[PDB]
Amino acid sequence: QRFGDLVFRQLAPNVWQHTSYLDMPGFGAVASNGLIVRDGGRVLVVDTAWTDDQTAQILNWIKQEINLPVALAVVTHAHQDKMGGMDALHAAGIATYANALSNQLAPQEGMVAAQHSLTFAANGWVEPATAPNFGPLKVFYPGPGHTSDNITVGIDGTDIAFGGCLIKDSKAKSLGNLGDADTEHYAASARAFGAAFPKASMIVMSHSAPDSRAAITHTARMADKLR
């Protein structure tokens, strides 16, 4: 339609969460979150919706609500929830980025790859040459947890960090879908995320409402029971 079926919640003066819902037989209405970030006179987008239509809606909300050009998007992992609307971005002329491993996994997940691949220093930090002018966006790769390619981003100046599918809600009873999980490293990855963004007080979840640092702690402890 025109942004009418996605939820957009203000999370900081310059940050908003986009939530869209899957409509697929055999599935419930499943929420997926990404972020929208105003960085001065430009917007940056973390993730897409399930479909191009939902993703197009996000662009419209930006256009109506913010009215600043959309400079880039990053996708945090390869699956329908975050990568589904890739082509909506390219159709719009938006430069997209993903972990190299993600772009390579996109086809086997039935998704279109981002235009550009991110490579990471052994630090776990993205190579500034592969992610030019990301501004406040700070991109960390903790290693394999929930999936092999899961990346996470921090938002400078807000004390918000986005954990992807990595961090589950502090009320989570399980780690969920351990199909692409890495049994051995999942606890260390979770904790490395926490050290990576030591100041962030709000942890945006992939599916649920934003949480505190306790979710990080909860996750790691659940993953200790994997080994």
Residue numbers in the entry: 44 to 270
Question: Paper's wording?
Answer:
NDM-1 has been reported to be a highly potent carbapenem-hydrolyzing, zinc-dependent MBL. NDM-1 is an extended spectrum zinc dependent β-lactamase capable of hydrolyzing nearly all classes of β-lactams, impairing the ability to treat life-threatening infections with intravenously and orally available carbapenems.. NDM-1 resembles the common β-lactamase fold, although it shows low sequence similarity to β-lactamases deposited in PDB (20–33% sequence identity). Our results show that NDM-1 is unique among other MBLs due to its enlarged and flexible active site, and explain the observed extended spectrum β-lactamase activity.
